[PDB]
Amino acid sequence: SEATWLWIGTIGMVLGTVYFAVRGRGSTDPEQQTYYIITTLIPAIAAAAYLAMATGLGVIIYWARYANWLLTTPLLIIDLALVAGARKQTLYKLIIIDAIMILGGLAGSMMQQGAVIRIVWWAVSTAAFIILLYYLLGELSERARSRSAETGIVFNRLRNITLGLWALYPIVWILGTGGGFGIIAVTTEIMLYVMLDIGTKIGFGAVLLESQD
Ligand SMILES: *C/C=C(C)/C=C/C=C(C)/C=C/C1=C(C)CCCC1(C)C
Fold it and tell me: Which residues carry this modification: N6-(retinylidene)lysine?
């Protein structure tokens, strides 16, 4: 099930990338084309990472996983901020916090001395997640609603998908082998990550690009 699910994820991300690329080839408006560039760059990086995983590279430590996360999550955050009309400084705060969360996940997964400081890293990354959640529910949502009612609705949709899917990643991590106590197998963890990435990238981007009229 290892290579099976890696290739499932590779094909899913490649299909999402080519669909987002061919869906935006007819557009000259700067805002829409920026949205399309970022929204197609996310699953393209995801597909590159999954191809590296399934080709025997990507694992030494699942470095390609954290590469995919560290590269795509800030682009998802940039899309969220563009939709919300957020201040540049708030966007910088969100990017720093998200990078800290993902790097803390990578650390806690990479440590070996026991389950103590690994779970401490898990708690630090989860606190980064909580403050990210508070920023998305507070400042970004308020800004999106102050833009317009339609903008508030679209950002509500996108924010709900984002938070609901992101909150599952630390669960898979603390239950998974690569990060926590190995309660679920490596293949089950890879399947769950594949499905979560399919959601958080393809479906989120489909909503965001459909919502441009
Ligand atoms: C396309 C990939 C995405 C959207 C990945 C998102 C991943 C996360 C939000 C992961 C978060 C983590 C924590 C909140 C704590 C435990 C460590 C992580 C890295 C699994």
Answer: 201
